[PDB]
Amino acid sequence: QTSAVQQKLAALEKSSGGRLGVALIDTADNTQVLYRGDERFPMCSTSKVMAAAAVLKQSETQKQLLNQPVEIKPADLVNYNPIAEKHVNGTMTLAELSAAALQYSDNTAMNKLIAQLGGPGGVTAFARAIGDETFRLDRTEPTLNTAIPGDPRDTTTPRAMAQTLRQLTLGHALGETQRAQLVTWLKGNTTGAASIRAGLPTSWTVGDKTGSGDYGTTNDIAVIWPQGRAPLVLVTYFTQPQQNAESRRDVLASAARIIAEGL
Numbered sequence: 001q002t003s004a005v006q007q008k009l010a011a012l013e014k015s016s017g018g019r020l021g022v023a024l025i026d027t028a029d030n031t032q033v034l035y036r037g038d039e040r041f042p043m044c045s046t047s048k049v050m051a052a053a054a055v056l057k058q059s060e061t062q063k064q065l066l067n068q069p070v071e072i073k074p075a076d077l078v079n080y081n082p083i084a085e086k087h088v089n090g091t092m093t094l095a096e097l098s099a100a101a102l103q104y105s106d107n108t109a110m111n112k113l114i115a116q117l118g119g120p121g122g123v124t125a126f127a128r129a130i131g132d133e134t135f136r137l138d139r140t141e142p143t144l145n146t147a148i149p150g151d152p153r154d155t156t157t158p159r160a161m162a163q164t165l166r167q168l169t170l171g172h173a174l175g176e177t178q179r180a181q182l183v184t185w186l187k188g189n190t191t192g193a194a195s196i197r198a199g200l201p202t203s204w205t206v207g208d209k210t211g212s213g214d215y216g217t218t219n220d221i222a223v224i225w226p227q228g229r230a231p232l233v234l235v236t237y238f239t240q241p242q243q244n245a246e247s248r249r250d251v252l253a254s255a256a257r258i259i260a261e262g263l
């Protein structure tokens with residue numbers, strides 16, 4: 001079947017010229033709303049949630065891990081690293097790296113998380129350990145953002161990512177202390193006000209992680225605490241046919257607004 005919400009998302013997609021993927025989970029009733037829910041999309045920096053969560057999981061067996069310094073060297077800087085560049089020739093802890101990766105989208109910070117996990121495949125291994133058979137991380141920053149149409153590297157589906165994000169933030173994939181830390185980090189994101197946040201009632205509280213890449217790839221994954229009902233999990237992924245296409249965070253806001261209006 002095609003629901004009213006799905007036909008509105010298709011109309012949005014048509015006007016946009018790109019390809020839109022949406023997955024909602026309403027945790028009150030566990031119901032889902034999917035648009036291209038099983039198609040793959042390049043994750044870009046939304047993948048940083050999985051990496052930070054994998055380090056949080058390691059910290060469950062190592063109480064001091066998050067206070068562990070990681071050398072930052074000049075050669076570690078990549079394309080976008082506003083936090084890490086202030087610590088070149090110095091150190092950041094894994095908590096600091098996690099916070100920078102999630103809340104500022106620092107790419108050097110993400111590379112340190114990936115290295116702590118043994119490379120991209122360590123992030124994939126964690127995904128598998130928490131029941132996500134779909135996610136794959138294949139490269140480091142910045143190349144994981146190439147977002148080439150048809151390329152499976154560094155992709156997931158909306159359905160899989162919504163289910164993962166629920167398990168991480170609201171479920172029991174992480175220990176309680178760690179779940180709370182992830183939620184705190186997501187709620188303090190600095191980059192999200194134009195994306196899912198922008199299509200929802202302002203009284204709701206959102207924690208999210210955005211992504212951006214080539215092909216005008218514009219992504220957001222969010223946990224949402226609406227006024228008056230149980231939390232929601234929402235993934236909005238968007239990618240365009242031209243390598244140097246413009247960001248379209250408005251499309252994500254519009255998708256979120258359609259979802260909200262369909263609840």
Ligand SMILES: *[B]([O])([O])[C][N]C(=O)/C(=N\OC([C])([C])C([O])=O)C1=[C]SC([N])=N1
Pocket residue numbers: 043044045046079080105107142145146210211212213214215
């Ligand atoms: B993540 O997806 O947030 C990391 N994003 C990036 O590396 C890219 N841009 O990030 C900045 C510079 C913050 C931006 O303008 O969104 C990126 C990689 S390839 C591309 N076209 N943009």
